[PDB]
Amino acid sequence: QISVRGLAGVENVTELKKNFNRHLHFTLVKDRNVATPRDYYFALAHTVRDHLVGRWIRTQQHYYEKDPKRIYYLSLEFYMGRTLQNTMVNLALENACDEATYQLGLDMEELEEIEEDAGLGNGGLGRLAACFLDSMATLGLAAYGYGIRYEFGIFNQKICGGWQMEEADDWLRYGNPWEKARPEFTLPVHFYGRVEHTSQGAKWVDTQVVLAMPYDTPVPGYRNNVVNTMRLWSAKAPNDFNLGYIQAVLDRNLAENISRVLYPNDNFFEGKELRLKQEYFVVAATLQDIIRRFKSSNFDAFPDKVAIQLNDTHPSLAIPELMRVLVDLERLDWDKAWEVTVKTCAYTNHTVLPEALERWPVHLLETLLPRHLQIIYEINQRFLNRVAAAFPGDVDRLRRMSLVEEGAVKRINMAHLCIAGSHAVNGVARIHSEILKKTIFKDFYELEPHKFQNKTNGITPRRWLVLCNPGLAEIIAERIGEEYISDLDQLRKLLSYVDDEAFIRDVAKVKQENKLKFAAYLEREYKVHINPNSLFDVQVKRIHEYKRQLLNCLHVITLYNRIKKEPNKFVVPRTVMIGGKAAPGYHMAKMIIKLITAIGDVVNHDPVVGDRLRVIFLENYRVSLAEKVIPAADLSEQISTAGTEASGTGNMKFMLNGALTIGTMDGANVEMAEEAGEENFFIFGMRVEDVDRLDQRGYNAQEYYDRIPELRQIIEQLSSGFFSPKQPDLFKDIVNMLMHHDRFKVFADYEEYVKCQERVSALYKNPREWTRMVIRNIATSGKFSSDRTIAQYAREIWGVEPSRQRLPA
Amino acid sequence: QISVRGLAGVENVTELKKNFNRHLHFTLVKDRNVATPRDYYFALAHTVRDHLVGRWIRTQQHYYEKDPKRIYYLSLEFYMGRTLQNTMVNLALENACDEATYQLGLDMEELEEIEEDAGLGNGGLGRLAACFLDSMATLGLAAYGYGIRYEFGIFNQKICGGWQMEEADDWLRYGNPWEKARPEFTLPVHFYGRVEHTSQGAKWVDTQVVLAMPYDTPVPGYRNNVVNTMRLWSAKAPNDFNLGYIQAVLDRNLAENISRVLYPNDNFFEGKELRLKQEYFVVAATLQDIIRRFKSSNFDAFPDKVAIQLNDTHPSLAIPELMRVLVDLERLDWDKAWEVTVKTCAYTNHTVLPEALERWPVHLLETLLPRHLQIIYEINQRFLNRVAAAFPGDVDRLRRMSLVEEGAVKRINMAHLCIAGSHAVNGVARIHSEILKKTIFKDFYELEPHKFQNKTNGITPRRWLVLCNPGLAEIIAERIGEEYISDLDQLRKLLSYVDDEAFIRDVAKVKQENKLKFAAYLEREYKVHINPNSLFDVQVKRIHEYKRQLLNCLHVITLYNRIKKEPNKFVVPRTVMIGGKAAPGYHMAKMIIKLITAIGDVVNHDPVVGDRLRVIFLENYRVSLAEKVIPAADLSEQISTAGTEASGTGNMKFMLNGALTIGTMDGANVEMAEEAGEENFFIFGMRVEDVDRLDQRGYNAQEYYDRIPELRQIIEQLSSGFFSPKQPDLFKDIVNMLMHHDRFKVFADYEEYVKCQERVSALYKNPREWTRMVIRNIATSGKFSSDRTIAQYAREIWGVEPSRQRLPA
Numbered sequence A, B: 001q002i003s004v005r006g007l008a009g010v011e012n013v014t015e016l017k018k019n020f021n022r023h024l025h026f027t028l029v030k031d032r033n034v035a036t037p038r039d040y041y042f043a044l045a046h047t048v049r050d051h052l053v054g055r056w057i058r059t060q061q062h063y064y065e066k067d068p069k070r071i072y073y074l075s076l077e078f079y080m081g082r083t084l085q086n087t088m089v090n091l092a093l094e095n096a097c098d099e100a101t102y103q104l105g106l107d108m109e110e111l112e113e114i115e116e117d118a119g120l121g122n123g124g125l126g127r128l129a130a131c132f133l134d135s136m137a138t139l140g141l142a143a144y145g146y147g148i149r150y151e152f153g154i155f156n157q158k159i160c161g162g163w164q165m166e167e168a169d170d171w172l173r174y175g176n177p178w179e180k181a182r183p184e185f186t187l188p189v190h191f192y193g194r195v196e197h198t199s200q201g202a203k204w205v206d207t208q209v210v211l212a213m214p215y216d217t218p219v220p221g222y223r224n225n226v227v228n229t230m231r232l233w234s235a236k237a238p239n240d241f242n243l244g245y246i247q248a249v250l251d252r253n254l255a256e257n258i259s260r261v262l263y264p265n266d267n268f269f270e271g272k273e274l275r276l277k278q279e280y281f282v283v284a285a286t287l288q289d290i291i292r293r294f295k296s297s298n299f300d301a302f303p304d305k306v307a308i309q310l311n312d313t314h315p316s317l318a319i320p321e322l323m324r325v326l327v328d329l330e331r332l333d334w335d336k337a338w339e340v341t342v343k344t345c346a347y348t349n350h351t352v353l354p355e356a357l358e359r360w361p362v363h364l365l366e367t368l369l370p371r372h373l374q375i376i377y378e379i380n381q382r383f384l385n386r387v388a389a390a391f392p393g394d395v396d397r398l399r400r401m402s403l404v405e406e407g408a409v410k411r412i413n414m415a416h417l418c419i420a421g422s423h424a425v426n427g428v429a430r431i432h433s434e435i436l437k438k439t440i441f442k443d444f445y446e447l448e449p450h451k452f453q454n455k456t457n458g459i460t461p462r463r464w465l466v467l468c469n470p471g472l473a474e475i476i477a478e479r480i481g482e483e484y485i486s487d488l489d490q491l492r493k494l495l496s497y498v499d500d501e502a503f504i505r506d507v508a509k510v511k512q513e514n515k516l517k518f519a520a521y522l523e524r525e526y527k528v529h530i531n532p533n534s535l536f537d538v539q540v541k542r543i544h545e546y547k548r549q550l551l552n553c554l555h556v557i558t559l560y561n562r563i564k565k566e567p568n569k570f571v572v573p574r575t576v577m578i579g580g581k582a583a584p585g586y587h588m589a590k591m592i593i594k595l596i597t598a599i600g601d602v603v604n605h606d607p608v609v610g611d612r613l614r615v616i617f618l619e620n621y622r623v624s625l626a627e628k629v630i631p632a633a634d635l636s637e638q639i640s641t642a643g644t645e646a647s648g649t650g651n652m653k654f655m656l657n658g659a660l661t662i663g664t665m666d667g668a669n670v671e672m673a674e675e676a677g678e679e680n681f682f683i684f685g686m687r688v689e690d691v692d693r694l695d696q697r698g699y700n701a702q703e704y705y706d707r708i709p710e711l712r713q714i715i716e717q718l719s720s721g722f723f724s725p726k727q728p729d730l731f732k733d734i735v736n737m738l739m740h741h742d743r744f745k746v747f748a749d750y751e752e753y754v755k756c757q758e759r760v761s762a763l764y765k766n767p768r769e770w771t772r773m774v775i776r777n778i779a780t781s782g783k784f785s786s787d788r789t790i791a792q793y794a795r796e797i798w799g800v801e802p803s804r805q806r807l808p809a
């Protein structure tokens, strides 16, 4: 149909159809008369998978022959989403499959909707892992994603009475055709036990064994015939485990619980044992596998053959574990083992928010990982000796820099461990990386300035343009060709089309189509009625105080109060859509969801309002909902308090997809505004510097309440039950927090936000100029490709060269 | 190679090879350089499965068009064993696959050994279910095996220090290529709750829901192109289950425990809740499915379209459940629902031993199945009203016949429920069925004589001859053709070959080859050295007091003591092999294993003994070990106390396979001796009548001890630590039981056993006459085909006609 979806040749289509029918019959054991849409999805899934297999085998073969340096991306989270469409895109099969399925009388788009998201992540961090794998495959790096195959991913979000309810995400119920179990590569992971000191070193004994069984999922590069591997570990009990009889068998579930469920916290540390077990499990199994591969190519060459990237501190135990293997098992001396470790490991920091930093109680590590604790103490001692020597007499520095925190309970600072044991530490946006050096890691920076880097985040333009927004991909392809899909910087060529009437018309047409398609999706799947001519004002992301969905709420109520004051005045109509999951134990986040829906209950049913203002809570925000709503958005809401959002990646998704951004100078927003020009961005609010100024003198919210009548009105409405008639005080916690303990200074940004929002409405009234500004955004979005990011990691951290050369078919 | 294994045509072989390589590549994602024997097994498994699929789809299609009466075999146990070889046999693919694999340079027999047994059964009962499915498919009945897909089957048995250790049978670890999950046919099963009485009937409310997900396994008939289904249910939690968050997800394991593990008790009732849950689970899901099918063809026709066979009382709740559906959900009146139920259901009794009879406490049923209990009470009342009217004034009868037992705790007699709610009740051998009518069900018989039938057990000659003993199958085929494989009565034609020198030579040659092959298997897999010229004296079966492995032990020690008395006298050399699992909680059974191995420790290391007497405990007796050891046996030990072994099926396996039988007039032994002639059978010991005589006067073991010096010697040796030097009193429980509380009268049969064993040795010294008697056994074994059995069930219970007509390919 459209060009970027590849060729639908007569041979190709005939082949796909016959393989489809082969799978329906032999794989699914169905015939045409009993097959459900789900059977059909499966037959197609198996058919597309068949095209991966040759390339997968060849690619892994190739890495064996060539023996390049191997990159190991360790993450507790891989937020993959659906695999089918992505596979077709990267293999150029999309049109062929559309055609083939069409001829069997099936709608491919309908079958695509049947696939479960692999929701093995919370948000930004998990999705970054997923874009990375895609980019690493596209850039022909010998790269492996290593994580945990959780039985249950991020919970499914239901709204009941405007409240979030959680349901188990049973994503494996119907099978996963993408994975391949590899029982033959099963490895033991050890827990508990005790340390025995002998003549020939320390020994870890009387451990409990859990087995780690790997599942391999193919990761196809973009049209380069490279297929990398994501290896996820499953926990399995050994067969002598507990071995009255019945209970012993039933108690196997204790061991296997390790890989049962993803912890649903976003930028929040919960110090639970099961979480530490997950962290050790993935690290122990991965390291063994890494070392097995290495030995099948002394340890001096390890760092020339291995890079290990730590995605946050979640896999920080990789550092003590590598030491443990090198010292205790391989019999290297400390100093050599340590050199190998530092040169192997690199650490990506994802946030500066203190609630997110992993500080594990010592008593937990003492029981669970007694040897790792000893190794940690040893690292700490030697590290602090370096500090002492560099900064003699600075006792305070020693305290601040220690891996071990004194206090109520002793804790290990996992971030301190990561910096000590890594040759590179990066933040995820320029401003975030600067903050790391100015603030939380100032001390570490002064010791080892060479370690601290920036690697600004990116997104894959495969999933995030071609896949989710084929209409926009095509009109771009029409002008500048297809080369940009794997070289996003080429989008700059679009700047010469900013005064082109045809292009302006096309850009606006795709947006309108996306909006119609999304408005219809709302009706079908959730029985809700939105005006497609309204401005689509979208804030989608995890529900957090720092991300200030509440600021958006205040704007929404303001628009509402303004309409009621002057019903007969013109306002640019808006659909305000807010979506995201709250962590199940995060009371305040659960309250914000309730407020959002409660505002909707009032606003959407007011006859005076008309279709001038709608408030929609988008249920079950996940990767596949993002693919739908982001192409449909006009305004991207990126309104975190300056200094809190380390980077963000949503912001990039919307830039790429023809939305304008309203946002603070926070995270990658800064680099985005710099790329597009400040005049093509709706920047408001305090800068980092202003927030600091407010902190020194003290944040008094009352001041804002006293001076801004519009704001006082909102707060009175909240307090008095305007938005909760049956429970007048439902929102007392919200009001109380805003007035007395707002860490995120919602009121401070209120005035500048509302004014800046007026400027958005003003520009929306002028379609041609709106669209021209959109063009200037899309055209400068190239920096925010994960290909750029990965190329930077490869050159400046991993010490490998990216490649765009095809492997042979 | 050999004829009964089918044709290896050039097209066939070429096809198999290319499909093998297709699977290796696409299914297994391996190439030739990385494939393990296990990969190869899998590729072949997938290749053979492909040949089933067409026939499976066609067969189920056919049952839809023709709409015949459907047989539902409900069992908690299906002891399937391996599927690969069986599939090849029934599809005539065995030679083709041998050839194809040979040309790829693989040994098919080596790959066959990689397959896990589906050990979803304990012993006789479970294996009977498996032979039945085979026969039902061979006789073209529209039949469905319904059970539970246990994650863990019968435990793997290790011997450590001569003691049984249990290990989890993780049979699904590497995948099961035979099953097909059918998530779309998932059904809710309800538990707990309470009963509400309304205007329009009783209602079962506030229940916990567990989901039952079915897995279908194909059951191929012998060369008739019929493929039936075994549907096994897996327990799955609903997604709102428990739904702080983490624990809720982890607690899903409570619900799913239902299908986790097979209870490893053989002829023993354990009144545990989890077992009752398993029993309800399989019944609830099966009935719903049965009814769904029926409605897609009023309830008057149900019994013309449905037969439900209850394999023991394990699925007895089918009766109250059917009532519950008909009365509470479908709104039939009691009497009509009851008529439908009785005409639908039939009950097979498997034992008369009281320890085996299911007597569920009322308090358990009250909590778990409150409605079923009410229905049970209602059945009881109406049943006892019939009894009262037929036997006025016989208050005692009423007590004896009640479904509800009075006492310490009230219990439901599940057997009483089965008789009341079934139109047919059968035993499993003539003598067993007679005992049912004379003793435990005398009262029920007098009320409804028409209900009581015999259906003597059988075994499938597919698995139990062709598959495990191809050499014997062939020499038979050479003389009389192949027709006997699906018509075992034709073995009678062999009687005219009893004086044929060539046949005698061939029969003896196959036995010798089987023995050599098995002796070698012992060396390879278990590093043990046996003389292949010895008589192979084999007792393989679950370890039980009633089966009197101890009697065998007494014989073994006798032979030993006789050798030591007269070292320089000739004795026919014997390898005595004893194998079987003990239930994990069955202390006495665990002691017998220890005694067996302890005898081995003494006997096998005595230089005076030479290779004249060896004692081997065969570890991990299971279906696939039976396939190996049974073809290799000379003497089948069937030595249960008369009246205890309801039938036995091992006895039949050995008859078919060229062993002579030493046994009591117990179970099917009686019919076997009747078929072959008593003079071709080594019958010894008390009859049923003699045991009764001993019971009236009282069993004094001391008497036997006082009168039989040979026996006194053994008992003194046991007592004084001859067989346990380091723990002199290890076997005090054994001695004490034999002397004071032997329910099975081991000493009573001792003298007659030892003498009869001498007659076996005498005949073994004369190979020609041994072999002639063997011929007379094989030739009369035809009655013991499960095809005869199933044909009898079909005609006299289910009301359907068997068929040997092929379905079209």
Ligand SMILES: Cc1cccc(-c2cc(=O)c3c(O)cc(O)cc3o2)c1
Binding pocket: A265, A266, A267, A268, A353, A355, A356, A545, A546, A583, A584, A585, A586, A587
């Ligand atoms: C970064 C930040 C700033 C403020 C608050 C939070 C946060 C996130 C959570 O997921 C959370 C939780 O699950 C339970 C809880 O009791 C408190 C929590 O607080 C995180």
Ligand SMILES: Cc1cccc(-c2cc(=O)c3c(O)cc(O)cc3o2)c1
Binding pocket: B265, B266, B267, B268, B353, B355, B356, B545, B546, B583, B584, B585, B586, B587
């Ligand atoms: C038929 C029969 C006659 C005598 C004994 C048994 C028998 C079988 C068992 O599996 C068993 C057990 O698992 C635990 C136990 O405490 C006692 C048991 O007794 C069965």
